[PDB]
Swiss-Prot record, chain A:
The keyword Repeat applies. The lineage of its organism: Eukaryota, Viridiplantae, Streptophyta, Embryophyta, Tracheophyta. The chain holds residues 50 to 722 of 820 of the full protein. It comes from Arabidopsis thaliana (Mouse-ear cress). This is Potassium channel GORK. GO terms for biological process: monoatomic ion transport; response to abscisic acid; response to calcium ion; response to cold; response to jasmonic acid; response to water deprivation. GO terms for cellular component: monoatomic ion channel complex; nucleus.
Length: 673, 104
């Protein structure tokens, strides 16, 4: 909106800041001169006639510029740059007082017959001290200077202004009395040393002002020498009012200073802790080295500034995230656990991180304690030990900088294996288990890449090789879930996705909970493209599934003759347990199509059943001439005889099927030769 | 556009849920299964081989998982695509307690 309406000045624009520093000097002078020109001058002498006029001009320009400078809103908190909007702010807030102050009040007083009541309007110019108030308010924002220190300095300036105005009003009250009664004033009876302030209206301006200000200052600290004191009743009343207000002001000054000392104690807290803790060491005669360790911890508490890490919980999530992305991200790259993964996965690890600092000798994680945080040793060294049955601890490989520990336990979801000890000051970056877990679920491919890095990290340290078996349990769980995804894809139709997963490392020979390689599922589904791809990946043509079937079994179940022939070109052969007896059961079913596809795979020509009957026997007795001829084509012999010594020819003759009788008669009579 | 991607993604995701339900009935994570019943697919939803997790619970012997599926009311006679009710795998696996539960 700053382009929308030009000539508008930004609230913190450079030139406006310079003008602020200029009008601040002019406001200080105007507010420190209005009481002087009011009390000590019953009409400003022409000697300073220029200096007042220019002064008003200095603020007159400021009456105009404040009609163009923008102001930051308190509702939308956004700088509003509209002259229509800008002017109203001045016209309501402070335009009236500044404009009344800008009049040539001294000239008006001299142009109205020297009427004092007109000169009383000069006090309106004291409202220009609001500029100093604004300056102090702005200075309070600066972290350069303490808020309480700014408060006490503001109170000191308040005392400066109050004493200056009080001295000016005191001299004015001295002047209100007629000169002939000047002996009744506080100054007209002053006889300090050998100097009597008899004709006090003719003394030099600075001698009079210094006397009045001496009174004001000595009463500001309530020294009350008594050399200069109120004599009139107006003087008495003003001294009472000034004294009471200054009592309140001095009490506030003491309160501000005392609060600054009490509250504003930073290293004094460490010192207070040291007091009684050194008392502790001394009354218990701790070893000097142990004393040094304790003092090191307390200094560490003020040197690790964990509070500077606790604040981040208050900064919102995203901005904290970018802080992490600029600080912890190098430390994150240094982790060998992550190594080469997607930059997004690494960034998410970066986002959710809780920096911590620990102490030399103190232990961090305990054996048997369920891992709740995933720690990276970034700058430091760390050593774990395991207490045995006898109690002696088991030294493990030390965890030097740019490493990650506790990760394996989190991956296996098992308690912390070894009680880990902080050897010295360590930059222990922390990741909560749950955050890492969600990040892994989103980035599953990166998760498996970590799994590879994990196996390498397992052989890296033999103490983690003590838990390689549990890690392998977890790896097997991952591989089973991955085989689940592969099989689910073979059922859905995600051809390219399952190819990508196999490229990722998915063994198509991996067995699922159903223990059927995805070849079976692609065969039964009919995704002949997926079946062919699995053929290129060297899946065995006839893997036996948990249910004792082949992929080609599932193909023939649905009769996917495309897939059936595809596997036949690979040499499809059921070779099932009792495949010929399963053909006895198939002739029991009577499915000539199922049988045709089976015998095209040609698992077995004929085999005796629990009744010692070949499937040809069953077909011949059943009169199933088509199935029996088709079995003879497969190789089902007619010389075979059942448990009761009956050949399939005998069964066919019993049935009386002319075509089947002729077929089996001719075939068996030929077979005899 | 994201809604259209999840038109298929949620279908695949439901498929994963059913497989995970069977997995938890095949690894032994009951508590996860109790949560998943109200925070995932149901046992009635079958997998590629049309096998409800009751078939696995018959094999494994997770009779407490089996009892949760009973509370759901999932058909104890629901066969797999291999045409076999979970009772068969209860008998084959030899889980006499599970056999008793499905007889009950």
């Amino acid at each position: 909106g700053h382009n929308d309406y030009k000539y508008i000045i930004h609230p913190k624009n450079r030139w406006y800041k310079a003008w602020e520093m200029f009008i601040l000097v002019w406001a200080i002078y105007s507010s420190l001169f209005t009481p002087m020109e009011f009390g000590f001058f019953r009409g400003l002498p022409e000697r300073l006639f220029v200096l007042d006029i220019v002064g008003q001009i200095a603020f007159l320009v400021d009456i105009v510029l404040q009609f163009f400078v923008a102001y930051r809103d308190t509702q939308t908190y956004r700088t509003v740059y509209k002259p229509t909007r800008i002017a109203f702010r001045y016209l309501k807030s402070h335009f009236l007082m500044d404009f009344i102050g800008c009049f040539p009040w001294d000239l008006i007083y001299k142009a109205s017959g020297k009427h004092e009541l007109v000169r009383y309007l000069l006090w309106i110019r004291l409202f220009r001290v609001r500029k100093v108030v604004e300056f102090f308010q702005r200075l309070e924002k600066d972290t350069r200077i303490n808020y309480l220190f700014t408060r006490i300095l503001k109170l000191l300036f308040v005392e400066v202004y109050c004493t200056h105005t009080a001295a000016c009003i005191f001299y004015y009250l001295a002047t209100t009395l007629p000169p002939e009664n000047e002996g009744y004033t506080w100054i007209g009876s002053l006889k300090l040393g050998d100097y009597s302030y008899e004709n006090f209206r003719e003394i030099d301006l600075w001698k009079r002002y210094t006397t009045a200000l001496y009174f004001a200052i000595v009463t500001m600290a309530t020294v009350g020498y008594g050399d200069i004191h109120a004599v009139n009743l107006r003087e008495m009343i003003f001294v009472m009012i000034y004294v009471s207000f200054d009592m309140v002001l001095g009490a506030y000054l003491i309160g501000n200073i005392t609060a600054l000392i009490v509250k504003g104690s930073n290293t004094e807290r460490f010192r207070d802790k040291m007091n009684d803790l050194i008392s502790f060491m001394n009354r218990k005669k701790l070893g000097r080295d142990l004393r040094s360790q304790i003092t090191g911890h307390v200094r560490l508490q003020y040197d690790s500034h964990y509070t500077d890490t606790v604040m981040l919980q208050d900064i919102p999530a995203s901005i904290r995230a970018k802080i992490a992305q600029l600080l912890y991200l190098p430390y994150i790259k240094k982790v060998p656990l992550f190594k080469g993964c997607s930059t997004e996965f690494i960034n998410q690890i970066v986002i959710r991180l809780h920096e911590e600092y620990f102490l030399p000798g103190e232990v961090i994680t305990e054996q048997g304690n369920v891992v709740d945080h995933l720690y990276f040793v970034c700058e430091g060294l760390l050593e774990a030990l395991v207490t045995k049955t006898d109690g002696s601890e088991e030294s493990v490989t030390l965890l030097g900088p740019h490493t990650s520990f506790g990760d394996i336990s989190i991956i296996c979801n098992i308690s912390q294996p070894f009680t880990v000890r902080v050897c010295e000051l360590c930059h222990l970056l922390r990741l909560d288990k749950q955050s890492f877990s969600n990040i892994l679920e989103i980035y599953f491919h990166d998760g498996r890449t970590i799994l590879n890095n994990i196996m390498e990290e397992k052989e890296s340290n033999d103490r983690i090789k003590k838990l390689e078996s549990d890690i392998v349990i977890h790896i097997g769980k991952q591989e089973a879930e991955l085989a689940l995804k592969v099989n689910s894809a073979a059922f859905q139709g995600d051809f390219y996705q399952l190819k990508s997963l196999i490229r990722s490392g998915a063994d198509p020979n991996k067995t699922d909970y159903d223990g059927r390689s995805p070849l079976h599922l692609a065969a039964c589904r009919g995704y002949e493209d997926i079946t062919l791809f699995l053929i290129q990946e060297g899946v065995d043509v006839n893997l036996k599934d948990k249910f004792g079937h082949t992929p080609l079994f599932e193909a023939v179940k649905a009769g996917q003759e495309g897939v059936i022939g595809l596997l036949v070109k690979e040499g499809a052969s059921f070779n099932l347990e009792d495949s010929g007896n399963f053909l006895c059961t198939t002739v029991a079913k009577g499915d000539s199509d199922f049988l045709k596809r089976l015998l095209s795979s040609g698992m077995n020509p004929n085999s005796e059943d629990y009744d010692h009957r070949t499937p040809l026997h069953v077909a011949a007795s059943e009169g199933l001439f088509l199935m029996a001829k088709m079995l003879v084509e497969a190789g089902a012999s007619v010389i075979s005889k059942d448990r009761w010594g009956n050949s399939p020819l005998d069964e066919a003759r019993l049935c009386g099927n002319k075509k089947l009788i002729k077929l089996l008669e001719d075939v068996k009579n030929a077979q005899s030769s």
